[PDB]
Amino acid sequence: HHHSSENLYFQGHMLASSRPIRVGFVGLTSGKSWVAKTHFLAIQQLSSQFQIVALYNPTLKSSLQTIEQLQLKHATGFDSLESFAQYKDIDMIVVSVKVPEHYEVVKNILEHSSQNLNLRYLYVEWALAASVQQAEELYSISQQRANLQTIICLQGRKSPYIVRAKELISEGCIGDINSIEISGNGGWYGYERPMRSPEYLYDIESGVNLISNSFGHTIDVLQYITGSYFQKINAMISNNIPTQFLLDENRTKETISKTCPDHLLFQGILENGKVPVSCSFKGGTPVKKLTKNLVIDIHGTKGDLKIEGDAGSNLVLYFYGIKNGEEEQTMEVFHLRNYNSVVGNILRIYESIADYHFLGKFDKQGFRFEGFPTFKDAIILHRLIDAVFRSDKEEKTLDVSKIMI
Amino acid sequence: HHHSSENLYFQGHMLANNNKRSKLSTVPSSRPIRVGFVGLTSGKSWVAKTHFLAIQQLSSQFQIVALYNPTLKSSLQTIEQLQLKHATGFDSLESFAQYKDIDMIVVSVKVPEHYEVVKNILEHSSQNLNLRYLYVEWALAASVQQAEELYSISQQRANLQTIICLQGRKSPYIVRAKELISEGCIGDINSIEISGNGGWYGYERPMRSPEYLYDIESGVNLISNSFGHTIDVLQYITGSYFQKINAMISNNIPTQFLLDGKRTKETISKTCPDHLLFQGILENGKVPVSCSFKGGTPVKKLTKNLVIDIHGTKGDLKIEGDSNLVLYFYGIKNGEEQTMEVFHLRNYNSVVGNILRIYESIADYHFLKFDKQGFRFEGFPTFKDAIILHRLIDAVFRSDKEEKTLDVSKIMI
């Protein structure tokens, strides 16, 4: 039955350990910040699992206002990361600050939590750091911490669409994968820039660009769905759009330089089955008009699968193959009618966190449906992304056969 | 209206001149191009069903005077079936090649035989001065080495025009796209995506299909052939050669299943490759191009099998199809209100249609020497355009052999 006791936990209920996981945020800046907007709402709907007991803000002011607005019952504000890092009532810390900043902050939290034994979770959003360097460092330092579980937010791995894809792929509904094609669009990196965008997104040294973020979340999901890591790759990155035109109500004559790359060519062979993958990622506008801007097209010996959507988003997964592992094919069209992905995917992550915690330190999620990704998953990703830049710079097809180690 | 005198040219009709510098000014110079074939196997061979029909329609401009066949019985049988009132059968290529009444020789034989054949044709056409045109089907030869050489010899024939059969260039969809881009309709080109399929190099092989096609060693494969035709059409349409490229080739399907057109457990070997990942930078505007070419079956069920998708600044244009092509366009009518055009020919027979167009261009050239057609709308591609494509292709296997991105910035020379 639907309302059976066995389903309480999944309905969000807790019998009377069972205490919520107490969370403390960094980046929960105001009652209208991204975090408010994304992480809070989510945590907000998982009341029996998570409770926010702390906010770190440069001022006690900012944190008091927020606690009132979001109406936070068990929160207490902190003026110092250090102090914040040491509050013994925190089980999990979530960091939501721009990447350029991840390095310091994180490195500091790690440093000042060594005292704190309650702290079992450290959560950070992709990308983990601004450079591979930085990230390997946060990785190594965390590795140092035996009882601390890390998490990276690659929420695309919780997309219903991806899950579904991976189920059909994993269940043999398209047989063996024969070839794969991907198209994506980075949004901010075309001929136009949106009004007031953190110049950091446009800077080559920030470590945030078409490649490290968009393609990154993308190829990661690809690998996830297919169950394989790459063995060899080759890239070509372009900068044919050196100055953008800004817009503001809706496009102006005002110009602005863009150090960031505006196009990525990626092609590689996945290790399992040496399967070929072709990838084309546009920086941004103008968008493609005769075709979907996001497409993940997977071609099997026994069927095909294709995720298409609106890189700006209305996704749909199409499947045509054997509902099985004489062979007879079936079509499937998959589209949720009104799913809030940003909030929803992040939310699933937390549930996943709650589940490991409530139901039952592990390495990474790798290709498992279970669990959540860890800084290890992030690191592997950082490695690849790094090999992409190097392949373009060295003009060579690189073996990345060994970055998951 | 339709049969107006004003429409005569287009209908492939040619009025007599009073013009001194015009072949149409005189009776003798207005004779139809006398054609000699190599490959006219029978009444049911491929040439019969392609080149021959084309010529049949261009009676006013072309005429068959000879065929070569290892066996005369063969050539005499063929002459009877197709009723060629003007054709003599040849026992030997050397004789066929010496025949003085020939104006053009067309070669349609297994690629692996191209080299020797054309090589000898060249060598023996050495006295016939009427020999003005040498027409060969793509691939020009089995390897670039062979190609370069055939090329080299021909260049040295001052009055011999050569023609290569890269008929995709005359595809109406290719011309339409070319016009569109040429005119600025989609602005500056930003990125290109291409997907194709080599038809037989997939999981199962058609019954009675010649082994050479599956022999890595043959010089005939997914790359040299279909990707070949496709990438040349791509550069043709965009008006650019490539700057640098990178390719990764697969052989995940070393053994196929036969068919008749049905499956079996009866199995077969394939050393030819089954997939190609090709990406590169086009010299003009340094535009990125990505491409995925599959070997054959199973055909893609959720997307069209051939797709040429071009993203530019002021618009987009896509040619997609399975022959069944449609060109789609959304962009500025000239070169802000963007328009939509869906271009599609009802029931076009591409197979003969495209080859016919090349013959019409030879005729124009003739009645109304050139290096290569390169990006011109005018004329037809020659051995030189074939040599460049062979070079690109050689570079693709090397780039896949060496695991490096290569510069091809100079193969056009």
Curated annotation (Swiss-Prot), chain A:
Family matches, as SUPFAM superfamilies: Glyceraldehyde-3-phosphate dehydrogenase-like, C-terminal domain, NAD(P)-binding Rossmann-fold domains
Gene3D superfamilies: Dihydrodipicolinate Reductase, domain 2, NAD(P)-binding Rossmann-like Domain
Molecular functions per Gene Ontology: DNA binding; nucleotide binding
GO biological process, alphabetically ordered: galactose metabolic process
Pfam family of the protein (one): Gal80p_C-like
Keyword terms: Carbohydrate metabolism, DNA-binding, Galactose metabolism, Repressor, Transcription, Transcription regulation
Similarity comment: To yeast GAL80.
Role: This protein is a negative regulator for the gene expression of the lactose/galactose metabolic genes. It seems to block activation by the transcriptional activator LAC9 in the absence of an inducing sugar.
Record-given protein name: Galactose/lactose metabolism regulatory protein GAL80
Species the sequence originates in: Kluyveromyces lactis (strain ATCC 8585 / CBS 2359 / DSM 70799 / NBRC 1267 / NRRL Y-1140 / WM37)
Name of the gene this protein is made from: GAL80
